[PDB]
Design a binder for this molecule. Structure first.
Ligand SMILES: O=C(NO)c1c(F)c(F)cc(F)c1F
Ligand SMILES: [K+]
Ligand SMILES: [K+]
Ligand SMILES: [Zn+2]
Length: 354
């Protein structure tokens, strides 16, 4: 009954040379790691080493063009770096960015491998830059390669091609890249909760609405839970898990659960505007460990209040280690009930549990 933890200080080297206060800070990961030491959670985990993803592994989800362009940034001078970064939606690049993205992905591959070989029951990956906005052919929203999507395909490559992987994305933003990578796939179920605001919230696409249910063989295997017109927190997220996430997940019967665990829906986040508490994230984690015989990998995505993300991630690791859920602190916001109903109507055709 062992929990794995991966963290490597080298992933701090990716940085914004124009704006050293950009919120996707190197110290996001050192702060989370420090809080694990502070709470004496680190000694209770088995340390899994980081490694570099290979280019062949990157090609599980990304085009050779995209891999080659990001790879080449390793040797560019600033004017090439600033120019290339400005060509994407919301990207900064330094000479260390490619290596850090490789380390984030390889850290998660090693963690998924440790879970799938029975060396650990579950695991947490304290990694940056994040992944879930990265597309097959382009970088986006602080993300270069889609770490969680790559980990799903890597897991399939070391087990069987049709291994059922559930990705729960509770970052406050829609994981456009993860949805698109798996949109025609019935072997990877994507469930995202996200602030939507009728398309006005980053990444600003109606791709995030509830009626996008998957394409082709993937019809029914993309579940968008979009929030509008409300400061959502623990009540709304608990309800979404009770009515939608867990019934669908149990029916899917995943063999591996990956969490695209952004903590920017947290109370105090400067960007998300939501109020999920650390106890709330602990309860979401605890529910997901009832799936896949407990095989859960928690992957850091966004989250920009250093204190909030540190407390919130650590509480998730505490649940993975078997600690019992802390106690939650309210009637659902009206629009949250509407959102949950809309999703129930859109996915009841595909999931008899609804
Ligand atoms: O957190 C994020 N995505 O998960 C994110 C992002 F990608 C952006 F481009 C801008 C922004 F303000 C964000 F909070
Ligand atoms: K999300
Ligand atoms: K899918
Ligand atoms: Zn986010």
């Amino acid at each position: 009954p062992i929990t794995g933890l991966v963290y490597d200080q080298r992933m701090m080297l990716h940085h914004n040379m124009w704006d050293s206060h950009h919120p996707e800070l190197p110290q996001r990961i050192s702060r989370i790691f420090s809080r694990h030491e502070e709470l004496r959670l680190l000694s209770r985990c088995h340390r899994i080493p980081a490694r570099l993803a290979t280019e062949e592994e990157l090609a599980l989800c990304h085009s050779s063009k995209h891999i080659s362009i990001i790879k080449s940034s390793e040797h560019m001078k600033p004017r090439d770096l600033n120019r290339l970064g400005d060509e994407y939606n919301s990207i900064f690049i330094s000479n260390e960015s490619y290596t850090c993205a490789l380390l984030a992905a390889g850290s998660c591959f090693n963690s998924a491998q440790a879970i799938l070989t029975g060396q650990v029951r579950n695991a947490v990956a304290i990694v940056r830059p994040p992944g879930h906005h990265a597309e097959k052919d382009t970088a986006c929203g602080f993300c270069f390669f889609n770490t969680a999507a790559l980990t799903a395909r890597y897991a399939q490559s070391i087990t069987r091609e049709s291994l059922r992987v559930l990705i729960v994305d509770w970052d406050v933003h829609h994981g456009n890249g993860t949805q698109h990578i798996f949109e025609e796939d019935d072997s990877v179920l994507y469930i995202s909760l996200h602030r939507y605001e009728d398309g006005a919230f980053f990444p600003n696409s109606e791709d995030a609405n509830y009626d996008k249910v998957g394409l082709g063989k993937g019809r029914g295997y993309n579940v968008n839970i979009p929030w509008n017109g409300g400061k959502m927190g623990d009540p709304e997220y608990m309800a979404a898990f009770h009515h939608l996430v867990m019934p669908i997940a149990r029916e899917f019967a995943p063999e591996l659960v990956l969490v695209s665990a952004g903590f920017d829906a947290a109370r105090g986040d400067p960007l998300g505007g939501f109020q999920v508490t650390p106890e709330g994230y602990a309860h979401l984690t605890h529910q997901l460990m009832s799936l896949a015989a407990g095989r859960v990998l928690i992957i850091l995505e966004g989250g920009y209040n250093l204190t909030s993300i540190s407390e919130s991630m650590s509480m998730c690791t505490s649940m993975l280690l078997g600690d019992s859920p802390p106690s939650l602190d309210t009637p659902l916001k009206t629009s949250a009930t509407v959102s949950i109903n809309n999703v129930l109507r859109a996915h009841a055709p595909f999931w008899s549990s609804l």
